[PDB]
Design an enzyme around this catalytic site. Structure first.
Site, PDB file in Angstrom:
ATOM      1  N   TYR A 268       0.796  -1.242   0.000  1.00 11.95           N
ATOM      2  CA  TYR A 268       0.000   0.000   0.000  1.00 11.95           C
ATOM      3  C   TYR A 268       0.827   1.291   0.000  1.00 11.95           C
ATOM      4  CZ  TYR A 268      -3.322  -3.596   1.666  1.00 11.95           C
ATOM      5  OH  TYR A 268      -4.051  -4.752   1.839  1.00 11.95           O
ATOM      6  N   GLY A 269       2.058   1.213  -0.505  1.00 12.56           N
ATOM      7  CA  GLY A 269       2.944   2.378  -0.586  1.00 12.56           C
ATOM      8  C   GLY A 269       4.342   2.049  -1.075  1.00 12.56           C
TER       9      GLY A 269
ATOM     10  N   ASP B 239       4.342  -7.970   5.903  1.00 13.02           N
ATOM     11  CA  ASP B 239       3.038  -7.859   5.217  1.00 13.02           C
ATOM     12  C   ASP B 239       1.895  -8.703   5.805  1.00 13.02           C
ATOM     13  OD1 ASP B 239       4.473  -7.376   1.833  1.00 13.02           O
ATOM     14  OD2 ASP B 239       4.509  -6.104   3.617  1.00 13.02           O
TER      15      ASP B 239
HETATM   16  C1  LIG Z   1       8.283  -7.275   0.954  1.00 10.83           C
HETATM   17  C2  LIG Z   1       7.881  -5.802   0.941  1.00 10.83           C
HETATM   18  O1  LIG Z   1       6.567  -5.712   0.360  1.00 10.83           O
HETATM   19  C3  LIG Z   1       8.912  -4.874   0.245  1.00 10.83           C
HETATM   20  N1  LIG Z   1      10.139  -4.911   1.060  1.00 10.83           N
HETATM   21  C4  LIG Z   1      10.195  -4.302   2.280  1.00 10.83           C
HETATM   22  N2  LIG Z   1       9.083  -3.646   2.706  1.00 10.83           N
HETATM   23  C5  LIG Z   1       9.015  -3.014   3.900  1.00 10.83           C
HETATM   24  O2  LIG Z   1       7.846  -2.377   4.240  1.00 10.83           O
HETATM   25  C6  LIG Z   1       7.724  -1.704   5.428  1.00 10.83           C
HETATM   26  C7  LIG Z   1       6.955  -2.274   6.439  1.00 10.83           C
HETATM   27  C8  LIG Z   1       6.814  -1.611   7.654  1.00 10.83           C
HETATM   28  C9  LIG Z   1       7.437  -0.384   7.859  1.00 10.83           C
HETATM   29  F1  LIG Z   1       7.293   0.233   9.042  1.00 10.83           F
HETATM   30  C10 LIG Z   1       8.207   0.194   6.847  1.00 10.83           C
HETATM   31  C11 LIG Z   1       8.351  -0.473   5.627  1.00 10.83           C
HETATM   32  F2  LIG Z   1       9.094   0.080   4.651  1.00 10.83           F
HETATM   33  N3  LIG Z   1      10.088  -3.014   4.723  1.00 10.83           N
HETATM   34  C12 LIG Z   1      11.213  -3.654   4.326  1.00 10.83           C
HETATM   35  N4  LIG Z   1      12.347  -3.738   5.035  1.00 10.83           N
HETATM   36  N5  LIG Z   1      13.238  -4.480   4.257  1.00 10.83           N
HETATM   37  C13 LIG Z   1      12.635  -4.845   3.097  1.00 10.83           C
HETATM   38  C14 LIG Z   1      13.303  -5.585   2.116  1.00 10.83           C
HETATM   39  C15 LIG Z   1      14.402  -5.001   1.482  1.00 10.83           C
HETATM   40  C16 LIG Z   1      15.110  -5.699   0.504  1.00 10.83           C
HETATM   41  C17 LIG Z   1      14.730  -6.996   0.159  1.00 10.83           C
HETATM   42  C18 LIG Z   1      13.639  -7.585   0.798  1.00 10.83           C
HETATM   43  C19 LIG Z   1      12.940  -6.874   1.773  1.00 10.83           C
HETATM   44 CL1  LIG Z   1      11.544  -7.626   2.582  1.00 10.83          CL
HETATM   45  C20 LIG Z   1      11.330  -4.318   3.112  1.00 10.83           C
END
Ligand SMILES: C[C@H](O)CNc1nc(Oc2ccc(F)cc2F)nc2[nH]nc(-c3ccccc3Cl)c12
EC number: 2.7.11.24
Length: 339
Positions: free
Chosen positions: A32-33, A158
């Site tokens: 959602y962002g 998520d």
């Molecule tokens: C899977 C997701 O839809 C996209 N990747 C990421 N997304 C998010 O989302 C947040 C969730 C909670 C928050 F407070 C802040 C975010 F940015 N943090 C993240 N922190 N680190 C990642 C991330 C960075 C590189 C590779 C994989 C991931 Cl899961 C990441």
């Protein structure tokens, strides 16, 4: 005690963030962002910053913004993504229009990657025990919302949050329990355990377990492995149309998992047989799976925390946009950083 904000054009929008956050760089799409990587100069952590897209555009949007904020504020576990910070450049409720969320920057997801398998699944189940103890269901666990750092330390992302992106030969549907995918019944927490089974199998074989070309082809791939529903399960399918379709299928017995997962640790095969049970009532839970002999090398009952109770009564509540916005604002204002 308001920090100083600076402005920067990034993901086709102006990001306005506290000074502490430096070297913002786009990572891609989040839930959602859009997400930016940043250095948090106050904590020394590489962080992910998510700016929510039009968070109060509709009632569905305003409620979903509230929902995500509440979920992230609740989660305080090593294996679950939580909130390091939440901020808004707004000085009052009247000008409140944007929500920024901050968490750890992870290194890779499980797409971008037996002892290794034990460790990764152990952490998923450890995190899932915690989430499930709060009466939260992830609902869409898949390798892309499971992330590791350099030390293979894992966090779940998520949790707790359309028709076209579930259509066809797509990884978005391959890890979904059959009862969710075809909307058979009011589903429980072990929909996530089905997903863990799919992911575990894939880590072991390097291949997708049920790479269906559509919902029906995927169901057939599922039933060939685990067998067609018996009487007991058919009764539990409240959808009369779905029940009727199931009964049209040629009955098939459950396959031998040792002949599917050739060469795998027999304790891994045993666990898979307990996760990938068609009837969701009979699937192993996260707490039960942690005690399974497969995780003997990692299992520690005193180091497998549960969550504080999570009040989700807001879910059955109908409110106005400005009411969800006001509740969201209160949650932003009341936020207290972790130690
Ligand atoms: C899977 C997701 O839809 C996209 N990747 C990421 N997304 C998010 O989302 C947040 C969730 C909670 C928050 F407070 C802040 C975010 F940015 N943090 C993240 N922190 N680190 C990642 C991330 C960075 C590189 C590779 C994989 C991931 Cl899961 C990441």
């Amino acid at each position: 005690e308001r920090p100083t904000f600076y402005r920067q054009e990034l993901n086709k929008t102006i990001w306005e963030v506290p000074e502490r956050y430096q070297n913002l760089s786009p990572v891609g799409s989040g839930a959602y962002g859009s997400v930016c990587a940043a250095f948090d100069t106050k904590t020394g952590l590489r962080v992910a910053v998510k700016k929510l897209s039009k968070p109060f555009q509709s009632i569905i949007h305003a409620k979903r913004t509230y929902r995500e904020l509440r979920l992230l504020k609740h989660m305080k576990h090593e294996n679950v993504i939580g909130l390091l910070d939440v901020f808004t450049p707004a000085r009052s409720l009247e000008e409140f229009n944007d929500v920024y969320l901050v968490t750890h920057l992870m290194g890779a997801d499980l797409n971008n990657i037996d002892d290794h398998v034990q460790f990764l699944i152990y952490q998923i189940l450890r995190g899932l025990k915690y989430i499930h103890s709060a009466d939260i269901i992830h609902r869409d666990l898949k390798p892309s919302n499971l992330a590791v750092n350099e030390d293979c330390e894992l966090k779940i992302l998520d949790f707790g949050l359309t028709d076209d992106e579930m259509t066809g030969y797509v990884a978005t549907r391959w890890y979904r329990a059959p009862e969710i995918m075809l909307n058979w019944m009011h589903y429980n927490q072990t929909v996530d355990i089905w997903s863990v089974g799919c992911i575990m199998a894939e880590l072991l074989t390097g291949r997708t377990l049920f790479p269906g070309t559509d919902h029906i082809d995927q169901l057939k791939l599922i039933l060939r492995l685990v067998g067609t529903p018996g009487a007991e399960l058919l009764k539990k399918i409240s959808s009369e149309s779905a029940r009727n379709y199931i009964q049209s299928l040629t009955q098939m017995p459950k396959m031998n998992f040792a002949n599917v997962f050739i060469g795998a640790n027999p304790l891994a095969v045993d666990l898979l047989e307990k996760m990938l049970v068609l009837d969701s009532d009979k699937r192993i839970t996260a707490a039960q799976a942690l005690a399974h002999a497969y995780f003997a090398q990692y299992h520690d009952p005193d180091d497998e925390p549960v969550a504080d109770p999570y009040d989700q009564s807001f879910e059955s509540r109908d409110l106005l946009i400005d009411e969800w916005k006001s509740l969201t604002y209160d949650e932003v204002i009341s936020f207290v950083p972790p130690p």
